[PDB]
A paper describes a structure:
The proteins in the human epidermal growth factor receptor (HER or ErbB) family are some of the most thoroughly studied receptor tyrosine kinases. Ligand-induced homo- or hetero-dimerization of HER proteins initiates a downstream phosphorylation signaling cascade, which stimulates cell growth, proliferation, and differentiation. HER2 is unique within the HER family in that it does not have known ligands and cannot assemble into ligand-dependent homodimers.
Finally, the complex structures of the EGF-bound EGFR/HER2 and homodimeric EGFR ectodomains were refined to 3.3 Å and 3.8 Å resolution, respectively. The symmetric dimer relies heavily on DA-mediated contacts.
Author numbering:
A (entry chain A), C (entry chain B): 27 to 619
B (entry chain C), D (entry chain D): 5 to 51
The structure:
């Protein structure tokens, strides 16, 4: 497996100063080979070095090189630009306005291995010093669909560069040297090559799924994959679980059934994903179906009538272009218990924003989010008003799946709040991502929580650091209630314990379930207090009851009917063959027939 | 730089700017926030 | 679409004389190009001609040329032998013992277009006069799996033939002439050809699904298809309905979704087949599912617990090698209402057979087949004992799908019986195949049945001919009951009508539902007699009742409770808040509170 | 031709025969029946 990184989403946003953005770009793209997000080279000034960008071999989004007065950007190993999300809804390779005040910006861009952009086109604009790039024929690199969406712009009134070496076809070179020439893959093919090839000979036709090129005729000799991957080969479709039989008209079980996950065909889906009947690893099924009970994996079955109104999260579905839970979308989260996406809480909802002219979000209105019980995406709590001191909206949240992640590393972020306690008393499973709780003021509250029991996937860590004092908060009632078990506790309340020491009346940690005293008559099972039937007599010498039914009372309260303890004898209950049963009491209160 | 119609576009005390060579709008975040309009918390490094 | 034929299943069975078998072989394989069954050339003597076998281009089974003393068998266009069912469980091309008493049998076998047998090997045995075939290198024609299963035998002590023409590679020719040479497809390929090729040049690599050869580099240039077919191209897998999305991790709807039917990828499944979620046209789904209600097409959904015990028919499943419903398998047809296959009734069940040492089938035992309601295959009734005169076992059979057919033309055969009437009073839909009722003695019974209303697929005919007299049976009570509608009638009983003239009491054709007389109180809706509630008073002047409920009586019999007519007033019925309701009658029998 | 252990193998008055050049057994049906052991009714032609 190649080294992966999520990249940035900064279109033109500078991060602080130029040095801070340069350090962020350095820390983001060190030792990365497959960029699953976006390659975004912005704001690199003069006298800098970009040698850490040489290892990038795959970008799944748009490449955006903008405002870079550095002399050389060595993107020497970039073999494929997939482009899952476009730039300006049309492009995936955009070099935009690289010049300083003295009109001396980017000089060399040696993309030696760039051979085909799958989805996207090329946008170059206002590059005066960028030489030895306009001689590249871009017919090989752009796809066969986007010949009209391309747009080129150059300025050649400098005269500071040199020409190509006379040992390369059609005078095409990316920079200085014979190693910087364009390797033609499509325009030098013969008639019989359906896709791309290596040389002018007709015996060099590559495979269809070989995106950039091939090292041989087989599909295992592809450099990069086009759509899917069988782990050493590049494939159009993954092998499904059931193959069709042309003889007996049946569906036979495939021993080589591979589940489609992203651009790969893995052997089995992971824990927090959904297995379909077609053999796929998905995040959500269709509108006519619902994700049913786990039998080891997650399937989907059809519902009766219409299904549940599934709330689309922030960043997927109808709320894809949104960025936060605001005053408009909160009316859509009324009566759903499973969030198929994200729940972002930003300061833009509570401070106001005149770009859309919306009223700010109300703190009592967040009680619409009381019914949230499951988050498939990641949770990002970032803002909270100074009135309430507890996250009372997420009181019924149970399982955070984390099918999408912020930075590909984190799935539960609770940062920069004025809360006192967390109050996540129902959080039982976190199947993906790391959990960071930092940047807070009045929240220590974390040294007892065993996060490894909540982590459903191994290889995870946490960064709960630098909260409050680390020795001074713990002497002012910071330690939670003494009936909490040492497995962990969230808040100082007796009900905010993770588990209890001896018994748990509903949610309250008690030592016993009112044995020989107390007003309710309760017993102990599964370390819980459970009430009995009210016709058990209160005994102060021995125990009261054992089971929930009326047969388990030791002595009845008012009337007895065999083993049962009852308030009134049956005096007209429905019997058999039009016989309402008359029953009279005894001196020992036995309801006799 | 950018006109008055885009107030509050750049969050967390980030300043708005206008790139005239591309006819586009951009933000400048403080250290600890990334994103298109300063909306993504820097979780991987430094809290 | 090429001309198709089902062929024969005669392994070594001679049909009557030699001339009768020759006429059957002539009528079977005239104007056929795709043999979906088996190519079986047996018992062709001297001084004959086999020019009708020149048009065969595809055999889906085993080719069996046995006991043929004819000089020449022109299989000149046979391009592919698929071999879905083997011969001796190992072979698909077997030429076996072609010699007469004077040791002069088959001389020439010019299989000019035979280039690859997909499934099967070559078995030649005891062919003294067969020359110019042993020089053929069979490495090209057999697959890469069956190099050891092959077995060759020749006798060259004749000296009557000649050698090949010196213009063909390695001296390989099928017969006399330069046009009879073997076109080598695999052994003359280069390293880069993954499958088969055309010539010794490396620029002739064909497509993988090109079975025999190719007329070009594209997949549309294949001669014959290997596994599947997109209607001008040869494919490995049909395009499914849902394609996987590597970006959003979803399942998008494919506009080019083709349903797999046999070796083809049709645009939609036919009427009597089953559409699956994978996009296939099947005959039966898995064991954990069942074929549910038709919404235009037939789907499959999961059952609770175990599903219904589905009875496997004759020729598929556990009863694949069987040939008739006998004394052993009839215990397996106990409590199933859907037959997933055939129900063959042969004289071998009723006459006895010492090859297996089984007792003969009992006529009362066929009542185990009373619960048969659906046949997916074809029905073949051929034998019947002389005691009963009506097919009383198939009294609840409703829909014959006909997913498999005898000779590919017929799905309902009722032949050679001693029955009087048919008794198929519940047969409502025949979705495939022709219906033949002939070769009988005491069964005219067919001139009224409109078979076009029962045929679910257009382009079907019948051969109900030569039964009894055609003018002499019709004067002895042959005409059915006079209350039958002219749409058709099966038997002479009043209940064996297809539909009724005026009303239908359950199944009996009546003129009216006992208006102003009769003992039961019935009304008319949907041309049916329906009884009312028994508290309707019998009126002899006007009508009695309109609806099924007790509110629809005009006058009550004994007691009235509002609109209802009741026998007794409610005297302790369950009410609300422990109030059993006491109700007393009136002089007009009104149950007052 | 074929021995006594295969009585009733060939249905509908078809005669049993033994092919000694292949060491196999075969049937001979009457006109109107095909099959391995005379079990398939000739439905396509002549009733
Ligand atoms: C609070 O949450 C709100 C949730 O709806 C959120 O509203 C969303 O704001 C986004 C800001 O970028 C919008 O993108 C988003 O949908 C838009 O609706 C427009 C209506 O005409 C569409 O035209 C628009 O389509 C195109 O427009 C942009 C413009 O730049 C293009 O760049 C883009 O390619 C896109 O295709 C888009 O669909 C909007 N949601 C809805 C439902 O309208 C709001 O901004 C949040 N923040 C606040 C109030 O501060
Ligand atoms: C009445 O119906 C019966 C339904 O069960 C039927 O019984 C079947 O007869 C078939 C006749 O060929 C058998 O093929 C079939 O199964 C066989 O069982 C044998 C038990 O040992 C197996 O050995 C046999 O395997 C192989 O044997 C044959 C021998 O020639 C091979 O040619 C062949 O390739 C096969 O692989 C096979 O599995 C049998 N079914 C059962 C359940 O026994 C019966 O013949 C009918 N007719 C009567 C009674 O006249
Ligand atoms: C990237 O990380 C490695 C750690 O293995 C370090 O040695 C290297 O200096 C880093 N790159 C840069 C440009 O600092
Ligand atoms: C760019 O390509 C798309 C196809 O994805 C199509 O809309 C059209 O060809 C181009 N669009 C525009 C706006 O030119
Ligand atoms: C096959 O049928 C055609 C009718 O189209 C007929 O002309 C021809 O003679 C038949 N073949 C033989 C060998 O009789
Ligand atoms: C013939 O091939 C089959 C594979 O289909 C396998 O059983 C074996 O290789 C051969 N069988 C025998 C009996 O030699």
């Amino acid at each position: 497996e190649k080294k992966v990184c999520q990249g940035t989403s900064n279109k033109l946003t500078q991060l602080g100063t130029f040095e801070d953005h340069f350090l962020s770009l350095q820390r983001m793209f060190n030792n990365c080979e497959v960029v699953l997000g976006n390659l975004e080279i912005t704001y690199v000034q003069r006298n800098y070095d970009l040698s850490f960008l040489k290892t990038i071999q795959e970008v799944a989004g748009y490449v955006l090189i903008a405002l870079n007065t550095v002399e050389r950007i060595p993107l020497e190993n970039l073999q494929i630009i997939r482009g899952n999300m476009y730039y300006e809804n049309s492009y995936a390779l955009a070099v935009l306005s690289n010049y300083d005040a003295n009109k001396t910006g980017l000089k060399e861009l040696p993309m030696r291995n760039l051979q085909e952009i799958l989805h996207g086109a090329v946008r170059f604009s206002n590059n005066p010093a960028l030489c030895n790039v306009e001689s590249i024929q871009w017919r090989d690199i752009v796809s066969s669909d986007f010949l009209s969406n391309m747009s080129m712009d150059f300025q050649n009134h400098l005269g500071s560069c040199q020409k190509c070496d006379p040992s390369c076809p059609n005078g095409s070179c990316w920079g200085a040297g014979e190693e910087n020439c364009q390797k033609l893959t499509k325009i030098i093919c013969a008639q019989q090559c359906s896709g791309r090839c290596r040389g002018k000979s007709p015996s060099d036709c590559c495979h269809n799924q070989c995106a950039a090129g091939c090292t041989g005729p087989r599909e295992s000799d592809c450099l990069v994959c086009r759509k899917f991957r069988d782990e050493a080969t590049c494939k159009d479709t993954c092998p499904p679980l059931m193959l069709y039989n042309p003889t007996t008209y049946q569906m036979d079980v495939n021993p080589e059934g591979k589940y489609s996950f992203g651009a790969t065909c893995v052997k089995k889906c992971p824990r927090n994903y959904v297995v379909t009947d077609h053999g796929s690893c998905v995040r959500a099924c269709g509108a006519d179906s619902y994700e049913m009970e786990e039998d080891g994996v997650r399937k989907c079955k059809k519902c009766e009538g219409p299904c549940r109104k599934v709330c689309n999260g922030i960043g997927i579905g109808e709320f894809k272009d949104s960025l936060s839970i605001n005053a408009t979308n909160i009316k859509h989260f009324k009566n759903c218990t499973s969030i198929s996406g994200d729940l972002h809480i930003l300061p833009v909802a509570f401070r106001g924003d005149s770009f859309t002219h919306t009223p700010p979000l109300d703190p009592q209105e967040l009680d619409i989010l009381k019914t949230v019980k499951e988050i498939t995406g990641f949770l990002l709590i970032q803002a909270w008003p100074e009135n309430r001191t507890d996250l009372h909206a997420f009181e019924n949240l149970e399982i955070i799946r984390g099918r999408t992640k912020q930075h590909g590393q984190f799935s539960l972020a609770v940062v920069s709040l004025n809360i006192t306690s967390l109050g996540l008393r129902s959080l039982k499973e976190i199947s993906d991502g790391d959990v960071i709780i930092s940047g807070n003021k009045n929240l220590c509250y974390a040294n007892t929580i065993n996060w490894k029991k909540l982590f459903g996937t191994s290889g995870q860590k946490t960064k709960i650091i630098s909260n409050r004092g680390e020795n001074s908060c713990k002497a002012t009632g910071q330690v939670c209630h003494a009936l909490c078990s040492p497995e962990g506790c969230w808040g100082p309340e007796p009900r905010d314990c993770v588990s209890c020491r001896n018994v748990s009346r509903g949610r309250e940690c008690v030592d016993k379930c009112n044995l020989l005293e107390g007003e309710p008559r309760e017993f102990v099972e599964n370390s819980e207090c459970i009430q009995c039937h009210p016709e058990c007599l209160p005994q102060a010498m021995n125990i009261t009851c054992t089971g929930r039914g009326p047969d388990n009372c030791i002595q009845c309260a008012h009337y007895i009917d065999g083993p049962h303890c009852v308030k009134t004898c049956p005096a007209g209950v429905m019997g058999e063959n039009n016989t309402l049963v008359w029953k009279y009491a005894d001196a020992g209160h036995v309801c006799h027939l | 730089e950018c006109p008055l119609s885009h107030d509050g576009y750049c969050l967390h005390d980030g300043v708005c700017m206008y790139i005239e060579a591309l006819d586009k709008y951009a933000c400048n975040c403080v250290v600890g926030y990334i994103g298109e309009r300063c909306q993504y918390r820097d979780l991987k490094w430094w809290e």
